[PDB]
Design a protein around this ligand. Structure first.
Ligand SMILES: CO[C@@]1(NC(=O)[C@@H](C)C(=O)O)C(=O)N2C(C(=O)O)=C(C)CO[C@@H]21
Ligand SMILES: CO[C@@]1(NC(=O)[C@@H](C)C(=O)O)C(=O)N2C(C(=O)O)=C(C)CO[C@@H]21
Ligand SMILES: CO[C@@]1(NC(=O)[C@@H](C)C(=O)O)C(=O)N2C(C(=O)O)=C(C)CO[C@@H]21
Ligand SMILES: CO[C@@]1(NC(=O)[C@@H](C)C(=O)O)C(=O)N2C(C(=O)O)=C(C)CO[C@@H]21
Ligand SMILES: [Zn+2]
Ligand SMILES: [Zn+2]
Ligand SMILES: [Zn+2]
Ligand SMILES: [Zn+2]
Ligand SMILES: [Zn+2]
Ligand SMILES: [Zn+2]
Ligand SMILES: [Zn+2]
Ligand SMILES: [Zn+2]
Lengths: 264, 264, 264, 264
C-alpha cells in the first residue's frame, strides 16, 4: 500500500481555450482564454498586463501581444487580482521572458513567493512556479504607466491579498471607468471559526461594500462568468455584464446562504 | 483545440512504498521508503535529517521519527543531496511542522527557493512546494550537531548544487565512515553545448574524482539502487553495496557512453 | 564636491544600556535594555522571544537567556511588534545562532525581508540585517508554544504590519492578561495625502480603537516610556504603567494635534 | 557602559567623486565616480549596466544615463562583478526606478538577497539595501542584449560569486575585446584554515589562471587603480592600463606574500 501519487491541477477545457485579442476599450484588450481573463493595456510608454491565467498560457499571451504590436521588452508591468494558479500561473515565465516588473501587495507577494503553496484553504493542491513581487503596493495607491493611472483597492476574502484595479480609459474619445474586480467567491472555504483566517467573515463583508463603491462604468472579473461576460461572442461580450452593485449584491447573497448552511 | 492540461510528477510505486526505520549505524537510520533514501541521525542534542524524498512523504517521515523517540521539535537540521522534487519534496512542510533549519549551498538554496521550477534540464515539469535555506554552506565546511560533524563535499553535475555529506558514526563502539554521495546520473541531459550549463562535462568529470576520494567505509545514495542497497531485505541491505571507487567508476562509464552517443 | 558619506543609525545611550532580567510575570521576563523592550517567555516546551531591539543587542539577549537557564537551542519562536531596526534588529543574527523560527504577518515579513530598506517614511536611513519570516500569521490567529497561547492583533499605523500580542500568564497562581501593544506614534510621518500610504489616517484611527479593546491587565510597549514603564527601578517598574485605554487615548490626542498642525 | 553605536561604512572621498561619462569604446561608457567603476553599454535594443558603486550613487548614475540619452525605462539589465556595498550598493534603488533586471550567479544572488550582511569576512559591517536577482547565471553562460553578447567567467576569491564579464565592442569599426575582471584582492581575509571558506586558497589560485586566459584587448576593474586606470585624466585614462596577465600575476604575488605572512 504505497503513498498516493501527486494529482495535477486540472480545469475545464474552456479555461484553456485560446482566443484572439478582444477589444474592451481604446487601450484595454482581453488576450487570455474564453473563461479566463488576461487584460492588456497599451500606452505610449509601454504595456501593462493584468493577470495571466493558467501557467501553461504563457506562450499564448506573448502571441497576442505580438498580434497587438507589443514586443516582449515592451511589457513593463504585471498586476494581479489574486495569486492563485489559475490567475498568476504564468507570472514566473513571463518575468524571465519579458523584462516586466510585478506590483502587488504584501499578502499577494508572500503567496506569489511560495508559488501558491501552503494555501489557507487548499494547502498544496494548487502549486505553480513561484515569482517575486518587485514593488509592494498599499491600499489606494496609484500606479502610473504611460499616463494611465491604476488605483489599487484592497478587497480581501478569496485570498488575503485580493485586489481590485480601477483605471480610466476611453471609447472613441469618451472616457470610460473600468473596474477589474477580483473574485468574491469562497469555494469550499470554512467561513466561521477558521484558525488560519479568524476574521474571514469580517473581510468578506467589508469587501462586499468595497466593490459596491468602486468607480465603474464597465466591470470585469478574472472569471468572466462572474460578471456575465461572454468572450466567445466577441462583439456582444459586454451585453449582459453586471454592475458593481449587482456583482457584489449577488456575491453576498451566495455568501450568506453558504454561511447559513455551514452552521447547519 | 485547447491548451494541454498540467501533468503531475508521477513515479514508480516503490518510491512511495513506506518502510520501518532500518538501522544503518549506531546513530544513522533509514526512515524513507524502499527506493528513496531519507537518513535520520540521532544525537544527544537533537536530530539531523538528510533528504526527505517525495513531497507526500512528510507524514511518513514524522511517524518514523516518532518511532525512534524523536519529537518534531527535536529535528534541528535538514541537509540535502540536491533540491529535486524526489529528494527535497517535503522540506517545506517539514520546516513548518518541526522547527528545523535547512543548510545548503547557494546553488541548492536558489533551486530550493523556487521549488524546483525553471530547472536547467526539466523546466517546470517537477515543481514542489518551495522552501528557504537558513544557512548557506561552502565546499568543505563542517556542520556540527550534537557532537557529530558533517563535512560538505560539492559534486556538481546532476544539479549545480549537488552535495555529498560525510560523517563518522560508530557500529558497536567501532567507528565507521559514512558517505552519503549524491546522484551522478544525467537522465536525458544535453551534455555538450548546453547553453544553460556550458561547463557541464567539466563539472561531472571533477565530481567523478571527488566521489572516488571520499573518506568512506559505507556508501549511501539518494536512490538506493545506484549503490546496490536493497532496503527491502533490511538486515542484508548493505550486503552488495558499492564502494566510492566502484560507484564513481560505473557512473563515469555510463556518462562517457552517453556523451559518445550524444555526438552521434 | 563628493557625494555624502553614509550615516549610521545612532540612538540615545539608554537604548543600548544593558540590564539584568527583570521579571514581569511568572513566565514573562524583560531581557532587553533600559529603554528597549525584549520580552522572554519561558514555557516547559521552549522559550518565546518578543522583539530584540537594536542589531548590536544580539549578544546581550543570549546572555540573559543563559542567566534564565535557556540554551540557544531552546528559543523556539521570535515574535515582532514591528520590523524596524530598533526592534527587529538582531533577528537575523538570532536565527543563525538559536535555531528559532520567526512568525509575522505579510506586511512585517516583506519589511523584514528587505532589512527595513525602502521604508514608507524613512527610505533607506534605518537598514538592518535582513531576515525571513518562517510562518505567516493573520489577524486574530493564535500561536501556541508550550501551552501559552499568543493571539495576534493587527494595529497598522507606525508600520503597515504593526502587531500587538496578547497572552495570559500567572502571578503566584493568579492569572494576569498581558498585552504587548506596538507603538502608536508617527514621528515625522506625512499623515494626509501620503502617496506611499493613502489610508494612513484610517488605519491609525482603527488601531486606536483596537488597542482600547485589548484584553489587558498589564500593558507593555516596545519603548517602555510610551506606557510609563521604568525598567531602571526594577521592582517598581510597573508602578505608573498606563492602561490600554489611557495609552490609546493619549496616543490619539497627540495624533490629532499632529494632524491639525500638518494642515497648517 | 552602554553597547557600542552602529558605525557607518565610510570610504575615501575619491570613491564618491562624480565624473562625466568617460568613453571606453564605441558603446562602452564609464559613468561612475573617479575611483569606482560603473560601466554603461548602449545598444539599439536597450542599455546594460555593470556594477553601480556605493549605495548613494543611484542619483548620479541616472544623471549620466540621461546625459547619454538613456531613459530610466531603457536600462534593461544589471550585471555585477561581486555583491559588495561598494559595487552593488545602488542596485536595489535602481531596480525600483528603472524597471531593469539583474543577472548574477547563485553565490552573488544569495549575498545580494541579504544586502551584504553575514559576510564571510566582514560580518555585518558593510550592509546595503538588499535586492533580488531575476536571472541566475552559470559559468560560461552568454547573456545577449541588443546584439552584444556578455559571457560570464566565474573567478571566486574576493567573494564566492566573483564574476568577470567579457564582451566584444568596437572602436571606429575595429573590434576590441573588453574584459571587466573582478577584484583579486583579499583585504584582511584569513586565507588558511578559514572555517567559513575552507577552499579559499584553491579558489584564488584557480581564479588567477582564469583571469590570465581571458580574451582581452582592454582590461577594466571595479576599482580602477587595480588595473592602473586613471579616470581623472579622461582622454589618457587607459594609457598605463595593465594586461590580463600583468593584472593576475601582480595579484598572485601579493596573495602569496600575504599567505606567507599569515603563517608567520
Ligand atoms: C484555485 O482556483 C480556483 N479553484 C479551482 O480551480 C479548483 C481547485 C476548484 O475549486 O474547483 C479558485 O479558487 N477559483 C475560483 C475563483 O472564484 O477565483 C473559483 C470560483 C473556482 O476556480 C478557481
Ligand atoms: C527529477 O527526479 C528524477 N527524474 C524523474 O523522476 C523523472 C522526471 C525521470 O527522469 O524519469 C531525477 O533527476 N532523478 C534521478 C537521479 O539520479 O537523481 C534519476 C535517475 C531519475 O529519477 C529522479
Ligand atoms: C526607526 O526607529 C524609530 N526612529 C528612530 O529611532 C529615529 C530615526 C527617529 O525617528 O528619531 C521609530 O520609528 N521609533 C519610534 C516608535 O515609536 O516606534 C519612535 C518614537 C522613535 O524611535 C524609533
Ligand atoms: C567592502 O568593500 C571593500 N572594503 C572596504 O571598503 C573597507 C571595509 C576596507 O576593507 O577597508 C572591499 O572588499 N574592497 C576591495 C576590493 O578589492 O574589492 C578593496 C581593495 C577595499 O575596498 C573595498
Ligand atoms: Zn482563486
Ligand atoms: Zn479563480
Ligand atoms: Zn534528481
Ligand atoms: Zn532523483
Ligand atoms: Zn519604529
Ligand atoms: Zn521604535
Ligand atoms: Zn569588495
Ligand atoms: Zn571593492
Amino acid at each position: 500500500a504505497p503513498l498516493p501519487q501527486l494529482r495535477a491541477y486540472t480545469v475545464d477545457a474552456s479555461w484553456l481555450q485560446p482566443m484572439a485579442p478582444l477589444q474592451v476599450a481604446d487601450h484595454t484588450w482581453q488576450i487570455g482564454t474564453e473563461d479566463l481573463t488576461a487584460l492588456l493595456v497599451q500606452t505610449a510608454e509601454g504595456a501593462v498586463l493584468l493577470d495571466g491565467g493558467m501557467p501553461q498560457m504563457a506562450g499564448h499571451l506573448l502571441d497576442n501581444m505580438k498580434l497587438r504590436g507589443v514586443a516582449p521588452q515592451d511589457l513593463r508591468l504585471i498586476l494581479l487580482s489574486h495569486a492563485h494558479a489559475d490567475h498568476a500561473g504564468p507570472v514566473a515565465e513571463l518575468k524571465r521572458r519579458t523584462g516586466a516588473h510585478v506590483a502587488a501587495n504584501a499578502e499577494t507577494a508572500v503567496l506569489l513567493a511560495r508559488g501558491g503553496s501552503n494555501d489557507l484553504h487548499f494547502g498544496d493542491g494548487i502549486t505553480y512556479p513561484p515569482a517575486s513581487a518587485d514593488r509592494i503596493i498599499m491600499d489606494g495607491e496609484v500606479v502610473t504607466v504611460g499616463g494611465i493611472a491604476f488605483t489599487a483597492h484592497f478587497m480581501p476574502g478569496h485570498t488575503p491579498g485580493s485586489t481590485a484595479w480601477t483605471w480610466t480609459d476611453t471609447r472613441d474619445g469618451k472616457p470610460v471607468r473600468i473596474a477589474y474586480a477580483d473574485s468574491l467567491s469562497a469555494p469550499g472555504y470554512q467561513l466561521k471559526g477558521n484558525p488560519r483566517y479568524p476574521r474571514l467573515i469580517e473581510d468578506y463583508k467589508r469587501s462586499f461594500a468595497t466593490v459596491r463603491a468602486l468607480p465603474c462604468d464597465l466591470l470585469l472579473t478574472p472569471h468572466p462568468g462572474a460578471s456575465n461576460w461572454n468572450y466567445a461572442v466577441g462583439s456582444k461580450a459586454s451585453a449582459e455584464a453586471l454592475t458593481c452593485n449587482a456583482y457584489a449584491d449577488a456575491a453576498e447573497k451566495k455568501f450568506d446562504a453558504q454561511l447559513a448552511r455551514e452552521t447547519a
